[PDB]
Amino acid sequence: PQITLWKRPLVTIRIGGQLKEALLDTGADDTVLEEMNLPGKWKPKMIGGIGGFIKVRQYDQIPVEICGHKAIGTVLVGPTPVNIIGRNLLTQIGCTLNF
């Protein structure tokens, strides 16, 4: 599909057996999900954005379906205000910016 940017580019994803709304975020290196009790081994990480850093849990090789396109990779979980799909998964679904 083609997604215009008049509004926040929110799409449906599936991860760990839940459907969620997530923001397609070309500015984000990583994919960061709102707090959820995901099974599996994880490692602590700190990630930065506009106002500073937050602590997250890094889970590897997690399957994530984005608008019906399958992806699998690292997902960070923590107190982000919004579920964000970053470049690590956007590349897997062949997402480009076009103007």
Place this chain on the structure above:
Amino acid sequence: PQITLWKRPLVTIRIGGQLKEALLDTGADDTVLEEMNLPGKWKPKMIGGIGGFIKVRQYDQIPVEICGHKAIGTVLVGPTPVNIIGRNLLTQIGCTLNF
């Protein structure tokens, strides 16, 4: 152009007669640049993201040339970690997400 996302989507912009490097960021409602002088009046504003809220200066109706495309709109200036072109100007240059 079509820009893939294996690398950060950094582009050159011109603003207030000066060149700068900025990140095309579909996750940002607004355009936020690192500390710099711009001509004209500004208003204090606060904006938030991961890591919380920051104070910025809001400049309205500022011309910005982005990868050769012209935009004129709001530019926020403040302690952002990177220069960010947000949806307010991405829409003006006809940018869409495609996959």
Place this chain on the structure above:
Amino acid sequence: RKIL
């Protein structure tokens, strides 16, 4: 919220 605004800037992600």
